């Protein structure tokens, strides 16, 4: 009865975990380049509707996510935001868009998704192109901390619950490296994390893109891991 881990979730199944009143994470697993990884997203209650943050990493997982939401929560998902362009965030957007969900991402994320051959959210989120930018979107704040895991990565804050969803710019405490840095800005990532720390000092829960949620220490840990990664790589 703890947060589910990668070995507890078959590929194709999705679990929900209650984080706060009206805030849940969704957890799925997927195979990528030969290994299996867990991945998180967020669900936030918006009246009698739900806001989804990130897909469940693929069409089949995302269909399973919608079914699990309908079963466990029973409110309609009306909008979704993808927090960067990789398949763990946008894979499944076509399933959402067919199910009548309005899908959103920054123009940067949409253009990078198109270039990569990934699914593309329908609507552009303006006002997030400069580091430190923040905009309101239903029950959350979207924040662009600067380049980190990717140049387009957004974080999401739920002010009613002081929940910070860091997406893939934030690592779990057990992480020992920056992971796949193909699209990363390793020089900027620690500064981007500092911007998050300064902007959301009252966060009570921090949810990484992959792995276990914790407190504010996930932010400092991430900066530490990324600096060490860069040092080892240099």
Ligand X SMILES: O=C(O)/C(S)=C/c1c(Cl)ccc(Cl)c1Cl
* Contact with Zn ion (CB under 5 A) among 41, 92, 145, 209: 209
Binding mask 32-61 for ligand X (x = CB under 6 A): x-----------------------------
221 annotated ligand binder: no
86 belongs to the catalytic site: yes
Residue 179 contact among Zn ion, ligand X, none, beta carbon within 5 to 8 Å by kind: ligand X
Q: Is there binding between residue 141 and ligand X (CB under 6 A)?
A: no
Annotated catalytic residue within 40, 54, 149, 221: 149
48 belongs to the catalytic site: no
Q: Is there binding between residue 182 and ligand X (CB under 6 A)?
A: yes
* Contact with ligand X (CB under 6 A) among 31, 72, 129, 180: 180
84 belongs to the catalytic site: yes
Tokens of 203: 């966060």
* Contact with Zn ion (CB under 5 A) among 46, 54, 68, 88: 88
87 annotated ligand binder: no
């Amino acid at each position: 009865g703890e947060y589910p881990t990668v070995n507890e979730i078959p590929v194709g199944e999705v679990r929900l975990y209650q984080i706060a009143d009206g805030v849940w994470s969704h957890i799925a697993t997927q195979s990528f380049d030969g290994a299996v990884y867990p991945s998180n997203g967020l669900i936030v209650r918006d009246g009698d509707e739900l806001l989804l943050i990130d897909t469940a990493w693929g069409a089949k997982n995302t269909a399973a996510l919608l079914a699990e939401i309908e079963k466990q929560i029973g409110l309609p998902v009306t909008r979704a935001v993808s927090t960067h362009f990789h398949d763990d965030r946008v894979g499944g957007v076509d399933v959402l868009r067919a199910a009548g969900v309005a899908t959103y991402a920054s123009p940067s994320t949409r253009r990078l998704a198109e270039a990569e051959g990934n699914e593309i959210p329908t609507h552009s989120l303006e006002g997030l192109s400069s580091s430190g930018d923040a905009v309101r979107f239903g029950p959350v704040e979207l924040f662009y901390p600067g380049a980190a895991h990717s140049t387009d990565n957004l974080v999401v804050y739920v002010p009613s619950a002081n929940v910070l969803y860091g997406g893939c710019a934030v690592h779990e405490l057990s992480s020992t490296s920056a992971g796949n840095v193909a699209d990363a800005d390793l020089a900027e990532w620690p500064t981007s994390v500092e911007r998050i720390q300064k902007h959301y000092p009252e966060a009570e829960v921090v949810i990484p893109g992959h792995g276990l949620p914790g407190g504010l220490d996930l932010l400092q840990h991430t900066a530490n891991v990324v600096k060490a990664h860069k040092n080892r790589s240099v």
